[PDB]
Amino acid sequence: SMTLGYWDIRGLAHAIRLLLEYTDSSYEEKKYTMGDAPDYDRSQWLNEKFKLGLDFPNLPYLIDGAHKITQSNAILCYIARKHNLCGETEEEKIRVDILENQAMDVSNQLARVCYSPDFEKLKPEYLEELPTMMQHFSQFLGKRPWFVGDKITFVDFLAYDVLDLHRIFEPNCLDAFPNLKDFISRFEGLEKISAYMKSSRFLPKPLYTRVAVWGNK
Amino acid sequence: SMTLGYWDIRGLAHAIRLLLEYTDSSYEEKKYTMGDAPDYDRSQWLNEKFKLGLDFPNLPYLIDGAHKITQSNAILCYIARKHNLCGETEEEKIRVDILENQAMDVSNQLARVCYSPDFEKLKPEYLEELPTMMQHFSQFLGKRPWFVGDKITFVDFLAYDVLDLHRIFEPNCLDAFPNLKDFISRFEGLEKISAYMKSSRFLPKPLYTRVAVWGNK
């Protein structure tokens, strides 16, 4: 088995947590909690930072015996490798790379605004540019069922999560693009995914950590 | 010939101008210039932007004839691939995934600082944690000549970029881990790298865009 560490928050973990589930990967949940109050006690994880012997201390981090890795993309990729959930042809592979970094780019964009007390100040600015943003995901998906082609890849996990984030932030987004709404259908109707969705250990929210103005819980 | 387009700023393309330089890739430079005044004008880009046909119109971008690869990382993966400077062995693949992203993490982290209003307030905090972050980089290289191991991969260029960045910022941050220093000197000593460095196309500064509280020019 393998263990995955992070907080009991969705965060950058929700993508990996999806990937491991879809591939019947027998994993273990390593979640650390931080206090509320004025000084968000982030100890739980801190006292175990060094004890894991990670190259670069941080979470999410994956454990698979002589395999302990950090950095979100490194983890997703690695699980994808033993499943071929990466590109095959040069075209597929480049579309995977673009989308890879692009997904994380927009996740971060939304994060920055949500991790800023000036929330409502920047909130509209994001909401106004957002339509053009969503527009392109459809421009990319377009013809194929899965963002890269007819085959499912790890990037299709990144795409789902980032789509659901905005969906809850402002539901009135994907509607203008039935293309993007369709995607969130296949990637929900999947036997193993519906299973995980309707399971006891299904973690949707909190979106952001206690230190978030919005999405915190 | 492939076209490389980015602002007249070194920025993120700095690693790319080295990589395609090293791989003898027949490139051409499309520099877009930023304006000043209260509204730092970027019309040159805005006007072109959508015309180029990038699935996700962003700068820097690469148009290898019939290939419009956007986003630095995806660009790096693209060039490296065609010149096999990628992780060959599974253990190397993990090193490549970790380093690439980690180097990208710290670069944007410094980018968070130089792009935030209160530079001189947040700066001491970065210096406050700078050494420890650097430590880990030293660990990773360890005894190897190149971060991944015996061979040179794209992640070396990336690393060299992020390392040099911190050398102009704080000349003594790297002055604690000689292991990292030698790596740099080795990198610069590479025949087709020294030539570029003392060539009319070498772009070492401006570091940040013409709006950054630090690094702009």
Swiss-Prot record, chains A, B:
List of residues binding substrate: 115
Entry's Gene Ontology molecular function annotations: enzyme binding; glutathione binding; glutathione transferase activity; leukotriene-C4 synthase activity; protein homodimerization activity
Catalytic activity as recorded in UniProt: RX + glutathione = an S-substituted glutathione + a halide anion + H(+); 1-chloro-2,4-dinitrobenzene + glutathione = 2,4-dinitrophenyl-S-glutathione + chloride + H(+); (13S,14S)-epoxy-(4Z,7Z,9E,11E,16Z,19Z)-docosahexaenoate + glutathione = (13R)-S-glutathionyl-(14S)-hydroxy-(4Z,7Z,9E,11E,16Z,19Z)-docosahexaenoate; leukotriene C4 = leukotriene A4 + glutathione
Organism encoding this protein: Homo sapiens
Protein name: Glutathione S-transferase Mu 4
The keyword DNA-binding appears for this protein: no
Assembly and interaction partners: Homodimer.
InterPro entries: Glutathione-S-Trfase_C-like, Glutathione-S-Trfase_C_sf, Glutathione_S-Trfase, Glutathione_S-Trfase_N, GST_C, GST_mu, GST_superfamily, Thioredoxin-like_sf
PROSITE patterns xref list: GST_CTER, GST_NTER
Principal location class: cytoplasm
Any one of the GO BP annotations: nitrobenzene metabolic process
GST N-terminal domain residues: 1-87
Keyword Lipid metabolism in annotation: yes
